[PDB]
Design a protein around this ligand. Structure first.
Ligand code: PC1
Ligand code: PC1
Ligand code: PC1
Ligand code: PC1
Ligand code: 3PE
Ligand code: 3PE
Ligand code: 3PE
Ligand code: 3PE
Ligand code: 3PE
Ligand code: 3PE
Ligand code: 3PE
Ligand code: PLC
Ligand code: SF4
Lengths: 316, 168, 101, 70, 156, 83, 70
């Protein structure tokens, strides 16, 4: 039955990513005083399916890559890791109930930089490499704050278990005691996934690294990128917007937890439509000069606050 | 064949080492060292070390090895010896595997056994905690001296590297 | 075994889409088409590495708060974070975190 | 006549300085921008349903040349 | 079922996907690019047909030539066309691109973009209205709907 | 008295983020020393029974060690039920 | 109008509900109507393996009560 469980997790993820493209195009449209896809199927419900077929029957380029083996390794790694980051998520019961699940997601997330770096090499273009280096430097810089912020929150939880975050928020959301950390966690997730106002890769007039890809290989990078947008917003809701779990009616948890995860995913689309784009030197200064000093200071505060109130959580 | 998972991983561990030890282009050499690192974590996980195994992914693979690949793509300007060394490495691995799987005893400097790694595992545990985790958390209660010297060295690493790279 | 199947399925699935992506349009027959090291980028990577290593020493803090020597534990925990902030200040004042030539 | 566009002197009293500290730390003017896009989300879009609806024109419109008869 | 029946329906599925997801690469060279922007504007909203506003040359299915093609610009145009993954269509927008228009007799203007690249649709006007370019795009959709690639392969 | 006010009111205007960082870090180092509940953190940590309470062989002169768990002798967690 | 954006949200919302609903039901199906046992620490694993020996049938989730005691 476990094999059925894996497929009941993978296929719905891909379908959710497929229809996120539609929802993104329509929310952006109405914030721009237009409609978005409403011709391909009722209210554009067949638009995602048309786009998929079109890309997979379009001839791919595959230029004279310096390797031709990194060019095929990069999208496998991106999509393979993107699906792997879902297996420990409690919704409310994990597919894999890890003891160190929060640490597992950091570990797998830090490996996604290779697909950005490898695709830079494979393109064989000197300029495409520069774009890959800027993207890589952005991702590693902003996962410094992901690790420290996560550590600060877990000091009020007591473990790296993801399902213990549900117990921790059984009386109150962690957004209340730790809203300053939530702000810098939310922005740090935009920078990680190269989202506006942090999308210099897709931000033409300055550069992207996945420029030589077309057809199916391009869609694989796209699917992995959007599955990470949903996953990080599911992580945020679990971390800062805990949903009460009733063991007799687990579906009640899933409905409430999904609504929160959608509202946070739509917030990503909302923020894209509202602001201009950061300069490369300016998003680096937002991390090394503004977030990091506060994150380090709040880490000191959250190591000491539980001790001086007698509120250290249980180890188990 | 699932009882010898640790030995199978170790065999893949060695083959990766023969990969980048033969020194192909740095791009492929770093690729082979990532495979060995992942296999290396797999071995540590099956011995009960979960925090240590995951620390390999986060700090070694997702850390140092990213800096290695990052520096290679920017300062490396993207033969018979490589193939000769690579083939020589695999043959020695095959013979070492062949003999330890035939008579289950090999003597090369040390006396190695071939029964199986599972035979040395401890047979009793009923704790309400992770023994590995307790030891690592002791870094702050017992390892006061370790924390000071390690922290100072990391601080000096920042100072030293900026001095070296200024160039004037 | 469960975690092993989960990893096998995800990467096996990704490989299938990749190869059938490079071949499905090749079932079609389209006519053949025919025909500087930057120092600041390196310093970002190295600064991340030294910061990343110091994070490795802070991850076991949640377990370290369960000890009976909280006075000693809280003293060293604030020492590591303070030292990590001292490194940031040194780079900041020494123009390390700049992007102008 | 002329007017200055950007020649204001910001006040340096504590209340004013604290007002800009709250703006810097709590992102007040950025969230003021999110609200404007939220309002457009609930406005009726200006899209017309071409080809079943057409854009208005006037009797003076200049299109396809043609030759007339008496 | 007959082979001629499966191929007919497969041709309709690939045609439907291709004409419902036309991603254009717009060569905005001159005044005609302004009218192309009004097709993306809220009044007409090309995006609601599946036609994305902007696409990169390697992710694009149609090239819209909107403006005057000069002799100093022609080699760049052909290079972008040769790098478009197939299938690829070209829409010629405006008098300048169709035949040179007001600058037909100039020494520095290519008399029509169709002598540099193949052209599928010609949209007349100077400039064509944003509702006239949209009519041309929907005329390219119907042209793609009449394609019979699979029904001709099956009879080879 | 006026020098400090001029200095503080200038960083608060030009560098509000750094002013917040040092204030927060400064409280993390000071409050635990002055907090009266820091002693209860140690007592809670010492009260958690990870190990088995190995019994002591009885010699006769041990009036402070109970013969049964429910006897009144020995450490009491009454303070914890009320905290 | 804005409510024409909802149908896309419903499909995306339903696809994110299936993984959570499926795992909860499959666990109960495979564990005799109870939640899947959670064994993070060695002590919990020891009890679960003991339950496997006490069940008669080699299954951890078949519980034997007082009726199994003489
Ligand atoms: C294969 C294709 C490439 C996969 C790349 C991703 C590697 C997966 C990460 C390893 C698994 C893990 O993180 O364990 C955490 C988790 C940590 O969980 P835990 O610490 O909570 O403990 C689980 C069990 N309890 C709680 C009861 C103690 O590991 C496990 O849960 C189970 C360990 C299974 C060990 C088997 C590992 C074999 C596979 C390793 C080889 C990987 C080769 C990589 C190739 C090179 C590419 C980088
Ligand atoms: C500023 C722009 C960015 C901000 C992003 C805002 C979007 C993120 C979501 C914010 C709104 C919070 C979700 C409200 C809808 C959730 C529906 C739901 O779960 O049930 C109501 C939930 C029900 O509560 P519950 O099921 O989540 O459990 C609460 C947990 N305890 C009991 C511990 C507090 O309550 C509400 O959210 C009412 C508001
Ligand atoms: C009693 C003890 C109490 C201890 C704790 C006390 C805390 C007191 C409050 C401290 C300040 C709170 C920290 C806030 C974070 C400040 C970060 C910062 O650097 O600010 C300055 C920074 C930049 O400051 P700057 O650019 O204006 O200038 C910095 C300084 N100079 C002038 C020198 C350059 O602001 C930003 O982060 C830019 C935001 C980028 C765009 C983000 C879009 C926002 C979209 C809305 C999202 C809303 C949040 C959603 C959260 C949902 C979560 C579920
Ligand atoms: C993952 C989600 C996406 C899944 C994709 C689903 C796609 C469903 C349709 C697949 C079947 C159609 C794919 C092949 C269509 C290629 C094409 O349009 O040209 C026909 C091609 C054209 O070949 P041709 O013989 O006419 O000419 C080729 C040479 N030239 C053009 C130079 C003259 O013929 C085929 O190869 C079809 C093979 C039979 C398909 C069954
Ligand atoms: C109420 C009472 C609250 C306490 C008083 C407030 C604190 C006073 C200090 C705040 C002022 C700091 C000095 C300063 O103004 O620095 C500004 C300067 C910015 O320079 P720059 O950005 O390069 O200029 C660009 C111009 N185009 O920046 C610099 O030149 C150097 C700045 C270095 C900052 C280092 C940050 C790391 C420390 C993070 C905090 C962690 C806690 C430290 C340990 C605390 C222990 C108690
Ligand atoms: C224990 C077993 C150790 C010996 C195993 C030998 C494995 C190496 C195989 C030989 C080899 O590497 O190739 C020949 C070697 C270097 O390769 P070569 O072909 O000479 O490259 C430059 C040619 N123009 O040519 C050489 O220079 C010889 C190097 C010593 C071997
Ligand atoms: C049980 C104990 C286990 C012991 C295991 C050790 C054997 C493992 C084999 C894998 C190790 C391979 C090491 C890499 C060798 C190497 O890099 O040699 C490079 C050398 C330089 O050559 P190059 O500059 O490229 O130009 C051609 C010049 N002829 O090119 C050469 O000179 C060719 C030299 C051949 C390399 C293979 C020789 C192996 C010697 C092993 C000695 C220790 C035993
Ligand atoms: C291969 C052929 C071989 O067996 O050489 C062994 C040689 C002498 O070692 P010896 O113990 O006398 O041989 C056992 C005979 N009954 O010894 C050797 O040639 C082995 C060469 C090892 C080189 C050691 C380099 C320093 C690293 C030491 C770490 C320990 C590595 C050796 C143990 C693991 C086995 C590879
Ligand atoms: C506190 C509320 C009262 C207050 O702020 O003081 C008001 C007082 C009157 O205002 P005013 O006439 O403008 O005086 C400033 C002229 N230098 O203004 C004063 O003169 C008060 C003294 C001025 C100096 C105070 C500096 C305040 C900033 C220090 C950092 C505060 C950090 C707090 C934590 C931030 C994170 C939330
Ligand atoms: C006992 C255990 C704890 C021991 C901790 C000891 C280690 C501390 C580590 C701190 C982290 C390293 C930061 C050190 C760098 C300080 C900033 C600096 O480098 O100075 C730069 C600044 C430049 O000056 P300039 O830009 O030209 O003009 C405006 C300046 N304001 O020049 C300046 O004028 C800056 C002035 C000096 C900054 C002083 C910072 C003091 C912070 C302590 C605040 C504590 C308050 C807590 C109470 C809060 C109550 C609400
Ligand atoms: C449409 C306007 C709003 C816009 C859209 C909002 C976002 C979409 C809604 C959030 C996502 C929810 C998607 C799932 C909704 C449909 C399923 C449902 O409503 O719950 C059905 C659930 C199934 O029942 P079951 O688990 O089989 O119980 C058997 C016990 N023996 O029955 C239950 O048990 C429920 C308790
Ligand atoms: C050029 C080759 C270099 C060296 C790698 C060898 C690969 C081919 C196998 C030859 C050696 C051999 O006999 O393979 C067989 C071994 C089996 O080992 P086991 O699972 O512990 O079997 C012991 C358990 N029993 C008793 C049930 C059999 O395979 C390996 O351990 C895996 C090798 C990595 C792939
Ligand atoms: S056809 Fe008319 S509107 Fe278009 S570029 Fe030429 S002159 Fe300008």
């Amino acid at each position: 039955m476990f094999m059925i469980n894996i497929l009941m997790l993978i296929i719905p993820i891909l379908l959710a990513v497929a229809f996120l493209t539609l929802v993104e195009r329509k929310v952006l449209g109405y914030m721009q005083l237009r409609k978005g896809p409403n011709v391909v199927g009722p209210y554009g419900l067949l638009q995602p399916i048309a786009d998929a077929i079109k890309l997979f029957i379009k001839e791919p380029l595959r230029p004279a890559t310096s390797s031709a083996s990194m060019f095929i390794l990069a999208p496998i790694m991106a999509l393979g890791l993107a699906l792997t980051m879902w297996i420990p998520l409690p919704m409310p019961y994990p597919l894999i109930n890890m003891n160190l699940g929060v640490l597992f997601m950091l570990a797998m997330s830090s490996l996604a930089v290779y697909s950005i770096l490898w695709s830079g090499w494979a393109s064989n273009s000197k300029y495409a490499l520069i774009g890959a280096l800027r993207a890589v430097a952005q991702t590693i810089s902003y996962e410094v704050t992901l690790a420290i912020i996560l550590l600060s929150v877990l000091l009020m939880s007591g473990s790296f278990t993801l399902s213990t975050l549900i117990t921790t928020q059984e009386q109150m959301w962690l957004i209340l005691p730790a809203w300053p950390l939530a702000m810098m966690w939310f922005i740090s997730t935009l920078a990680e996934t190269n989202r506006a106002p942090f999308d210099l890769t897709e931000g033409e007039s300055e550069l992207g690294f996945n420029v030589e890809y077309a057809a199916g290989p391009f869609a694989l990078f796209f699917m992995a990128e959007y599955a990470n947008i949903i996953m990080m917003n599911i992580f945020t809701a679990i971390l800062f917007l805990g949903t009460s779990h009733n063991p007799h009616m687990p579906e009640l948890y899933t409905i409430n937890f999904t609504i929160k995860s959608l509202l946070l995913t739509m917030s990503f689309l909302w923020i894209r439509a509202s602001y201009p784009r950061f300069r490369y030197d300016q998003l680096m200064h937002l991390l090394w000069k503004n977030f990091l000093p506060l994150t380090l200071a709040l880490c000191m505060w959250h190591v000491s606050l539980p001790i001086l109130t007698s509120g250290i959580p249980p180890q188990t | 064949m699932m009882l010898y998972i640790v030995f199978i991983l170790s065999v893949i561990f060695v083959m990766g080492f023969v990969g980048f030890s033969s020194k192909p282009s740095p791009i492929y050499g770093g690729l082979g060292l990532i495979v060995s690192g992942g296999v290396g974590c797999g071995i540590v996980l099956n011995f009960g070390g979960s925090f240590l195994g995951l620390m390999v992914f986060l700090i070694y693979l997702g850390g140092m090895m990213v800096v290695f690949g990052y520096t290679t793509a920017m300062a490396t300007e993207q033969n018979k010896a490589v193939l000769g060394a690579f083939v020589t490495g695999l043959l020695m691995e095959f013979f070492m595997v062949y003999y330890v799987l035939k008579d289950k005893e090999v003597e090369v400097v040390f006396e190695f056994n071939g029964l199986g790694d599972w035979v040395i595992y401890d047979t009793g545990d009923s704790g309400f905690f992770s023994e590995e985790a307790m030891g690592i958390a002791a870094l702050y209660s017992y390892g006061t001296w370790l924390v000071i010297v390690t922290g100072w060295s990391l601080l000096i690493g920042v100072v030293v590297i900026m001095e070296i790279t200024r160039g004037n | 075994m469960n975690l092993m199947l989960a990893l096998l399925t995800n990467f096996t699935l990704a490989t299938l889409l990749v190869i059938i992506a490079f071949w499905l349009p090749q079932l079609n027959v389209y006519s053949e088409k025919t025909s500087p090291f930057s120092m600041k980028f390196f310093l970002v990577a190295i600064t991340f590495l030294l910061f990343d290593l110091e994070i490795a020493l802070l991850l076991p803090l949640p377990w370290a708060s369960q000890t009976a020597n909280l006075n000693t534990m809280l003293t060293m925990a604030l020492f590591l974070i303070i030292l990590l902030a001292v490194s940031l200040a040194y780079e900041w004042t020494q123009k390390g975190l700049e992007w102008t030539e | 006549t002329y007017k200055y566009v950007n020649l204001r002197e910001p006040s340096m009293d504590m209340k004013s300085v604290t007002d800009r500290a709250a703006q810097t730390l709590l992102w007040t003017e950025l969230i003021r921008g999110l609200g404007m896009t939220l309002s457009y989300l609930f406005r009726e879009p200006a899209t017309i349903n071409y080809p079943f609806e057409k854009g208005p024109l006037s009797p003076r419109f200049r299109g396809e040349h043609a030759l007339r008869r008496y | 079922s007959r082979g001629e029946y499966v191929v007919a329906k497969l041709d309709d599925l690939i045609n439907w996907a291709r004409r419902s997801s036309l991603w254009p690469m717009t060569f905005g060279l001159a005044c005609c690019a302004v009218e192309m922007m009004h097709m993306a504007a809220p009044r007409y909203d090309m995006d609601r047909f599946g036609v994305v506003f902007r696409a990169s040359p390697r992710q694009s299915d149609v090239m819209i030539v909107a403006g005057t093609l000069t002799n100093k610009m022609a080699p760049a145009l052909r290079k972008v066309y040769d790098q478009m993954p197939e299938p690829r269509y070209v829409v010629s927008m405006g008098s300048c691109a169709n035949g040179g228009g007001y600058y037909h007799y100039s020494y520095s203007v290519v008399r029509g973009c169709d002598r540099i690249v193949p052209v599928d649709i010609y949209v007349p006007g100077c400039p064509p209205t944003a509702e006239a370019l949209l009519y041309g795009i929907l005329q390219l959709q119907k042209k793609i709907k009449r394609e019979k690639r699979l029904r001709i392969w099956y009879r080879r | 008295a006026e020098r400090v006010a001029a200095f503080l009111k200038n960083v608060w205007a030009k560098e509000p983020v750094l002013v917040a960082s040092f204030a927060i870090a400064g409280l993390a180092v000071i409050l635990p020393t002055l907090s009266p509940y820091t002693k209860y953190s140690l007592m809670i940590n010492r009260a958690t029974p990870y190990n088995y309470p190995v019994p002591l062989r009885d010699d006769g002169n041990m009036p402070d060690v109970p013969s049964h768990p429910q006897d009144p002798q020995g450490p009491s967690l009454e303070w914890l039920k009320r905290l | 109008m804005w409510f024409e954006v909802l149908p896309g949200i419903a499909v995306m919302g339903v696809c994110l509900f299936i993984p959570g609903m499926a795992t909860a039901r499959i666990h109960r199906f495979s564990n005799g109507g109870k939640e899947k046992r959670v064994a993070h620490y060695p002590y919990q694993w020891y009890l679960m393996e003991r339950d496997r020996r006490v069940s008669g049938v080699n299954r951890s989730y078949v519980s034997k009560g007082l009726e199994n005691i003489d």
